[PDB]
Design a protein around this ligand. Structure first.
Ligand SMILES: [Ca+2]
Ligand SMILES: [Ca+2]
Ligand SMILES: [Ca+2]
Ligand SMILES: [Ca+2]
Ligand SMILES: [Ca+2]
Ligand SMILES: [Ca+2]
Ligand SMILES: [Ca+2]
Ligand SMILES: [Ca+2]
Ligand SMILES: [Ca+2]
Ligand SMILES: [Ca+2]
Ligand SMILES: [Ca+2]
Ligand SMILES: [Ca+2]
Ligand SMILES: [Ca+2]
Ligand SMILES: [Ca+2]
Lengths: 172, 172, 172, 172, 172, 172
């Protein structure tokens, strides 16, 4: 038992390790998406930039959890970071839809983590999740929803013009 | 009778109170429109910004009338601010058409108020209305007309691309 | 169901709509109070300024809730904004006492909203209310209490001198 | 009953008074430690500076609680501030170990206070404790743990060289 | 016997420890007074600020004595800091009268300490007391006398207006 | 076949994909090491900082290869990023020794990649590897060798003092 450990349940420690992996996985998905848009036969530089930014953001979230783990006297246990489900992401719209799905899954995990912290009467962990993650996640989801709506209304994915103009005017 | 009151007819005092309510109502309509465009399934941020600006402008007009009421020794009597006729505003074009209709109704009220002030030989009130409101209203109406014309010519509301591009290039 | 919606109960959505209306109502009360102090037979410019500031603050609170509603995939439904209970607010002390009563009623609503969010296991909504509203409300109430105490100790409302000096030295 | 009081349980009011005393006590412990390191036969100026900083921090925490008490309409009741358990703190390592023990006891009190606020459905008080104290306390504990680890690994307390070098390189 | 100790009598060492406690006690009294004026039913912010400043000043005096103790090779022995005699300080005038009484008691202790240092032929200690404390104390007493006089002449404590105006114009 | 593809062998494309994975793996190893040194029972902040820097560097190398893949008309295929071989890295020296081993393995892969590019007469790929990676890798290896030597000479890992001082004076 760590000399710093206090009011930190074994289950919370484990759930934090799972959340670290999930955040790294989400970083990897966004990395994959980014470089798809960098392909010469896709060539949407601002979609590429957008998802690369998301990738780095997820990695930062992971690192903050690793810091939290140590702050509470828990022990970090890393797992394989799974390759994303797709190598080819189809279109800007499809990638945005996939990102929305991903962010809602990450949000579900955050909510379960918060439920667990609540059940274990760990107000420090509840506060940590609220402070750093819950509103961040709601904002991300809202933004992805907004992007999906605009792309659909513009005529994506069939309109390559729509995805081109969205790349310039929203993502650029 | 207020110690400051002079040449200020009871009817004018009452019409000013009605105009205060109408301006607050118009503020509320524009507030409603603004946040419609903030919905994730509408997502036109510059339409949202445009109508929020209009909302605050109408509130300022109301406050200036409340100040006028007191300046002349009249007494402010507030009424309920009615909820707008619509919760869902359909499209950017439809909202602009609705705003045009609203601004012309407010203009009609201003003109009737000016007629009343003229009939009561209240040149201070005539001047107040001319100075702060009549040209402001003509400019607003002209701008809304311009916006409606462009949206129609671009292919709104059926073209989601048209409303997207107008949001970026005119309202942004 | 909104593409962004997640862990957001129907009851919470409805309570948010009620809170939007209550905040707009509170904005309206403070607007009414402000311009009472602008009357030539009251003439306390800093009481006027104080309540106008409060009015704009309540409107901002309302707008932030409208933003929250959309962020979570809820749908804004606006209602009439009721006229305040008084047209004449009597004295600076009486208005401050009325403001205290109002702020405690708004606080009660916030607390019920937080209870509802807690009951529906919505930590994002709990956090939103805590972050933006609960401490703001406690500070407001404390300040109004302070003002009431000073006005009473100075001899308000019978001492017009007391209300004059408080206007200058506390509110100015 | 205070005119500002709302949703503030008698038990919470009392627990806040106990927490004020505990924070003042912790301020006193750290004051005692600081000046031990100022002795000519101890002479570790940066250990002295470190604990004096901690002392002032605990006093600030106490004052913020006194402010909270009044904000909520509670009434501050002060108690004797007990002298620390030791006059002589032995060594830098021993003092750090004692500080760790102290901070974990203060943390336990904070957690019990948060449990009480949770049980009394006082989300404002929960938020206050989370905002100002829980993460602050976790950071403090982590830092003290870090210091203890380094001092032990360096060969303290038997190595006067170790405590000298830690004073220079970590605390200086 | 400390390697630095020279011409420092056991009795002086002990009297310095008593003076440290008295200064901490005076810090505590002023802390208590400060937050009384922070209550919503007292609400004199500049009385609050004034006494908080005094509190910090007394703590600084205590710390300087702790430094002196070590400088001379004496050993600091801390005692409980007694809670102040009052929880409720009644009025601004009453608190000022209480502060005057306190400062004169502290002054009496300083004078006895100086007598002791004189009797033990300790010119360094005599000089320390003269330099840091005797004139400081005379100035404090004079200022408190001045404040009491003005408050009485203005009609305090019965005039809440008097205490309000003194808070603004002397303490603000 | 990509419209940009020219003189880019299938085998090279595949080896680039393997190198991307290896770089991501090396990023993960260094991430793991970094946060080990962040543990409260290890507490070497500059070892932590050093390895975190290395982690980000490896990720950048990976991203540059992903860019290269697309530049040449190859197709990125991502694989699982394997968890590092250790969860606990023992000591600063042991981690440095492990980093040296890792960097030499990465170097071996780079050299094989360069051999492959040479065998396939791909001077652009040879130049890319030389420009961005070969000298970078030699410098990294040299630095890690230097660090290992100093740690050993200082008496690590048995001397916790040695690792403490190296953390301060070399890594800080
Ligand atoms: Ca994101
Ligand atoms: Ca796999
Ligand atoms: Ca307008
Ligand atoms: Ca109605
Ligand atoms: Ca307010
Ligand atoms: Ca009504
Ligand atoms: Ca501390
Ligand atoms: Ca005792
Ligand atoms: Ca919270
Ligand atoms: Ca003083
Ligand atoms: Ca006692
Ligand atoms: Ca490197
Ligand atoms: Ca594996
Ligand atoms: Ca070359």
């Amino acid at each position: 038992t760590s000399q710093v450990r206090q009011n930190y349940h074994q289950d919370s420690e484990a759930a934090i390790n799972r959340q670290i992996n999930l955040d790294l996985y989400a970083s990897y998905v966004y990395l994959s998406m980014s470089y798809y848009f960098d392909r010469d036969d896709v060539a949407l530089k601002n979609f590429a930039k957008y998802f690369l930014h998301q990738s780095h953001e997820e990695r930062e979230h992971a690192e903050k959890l690793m810091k939290l783990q140590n702050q509470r006297g828990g022990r970090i246990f890393l797992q394989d970071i799974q390759k994303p489900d797709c190598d080819d992401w189809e279109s800007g719209l499809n990638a945005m839809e996939c990102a929305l799905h991903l962010d809602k899954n990450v949000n579900q995990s955050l909510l379960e983590l918060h439920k667990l912290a609540t059940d274990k009467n760990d107000p420090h962990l509840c506060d940590f999740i609220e402070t750093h993650y819950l509103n961040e996640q709601v904002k991300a989801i809202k933004e992805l929803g907004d992007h999906v709506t605009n792309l659909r209304k513009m005529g994506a994915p069939e309109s390559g013009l729509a995805e081109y103009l969205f790349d310039k005017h929203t993502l650029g």
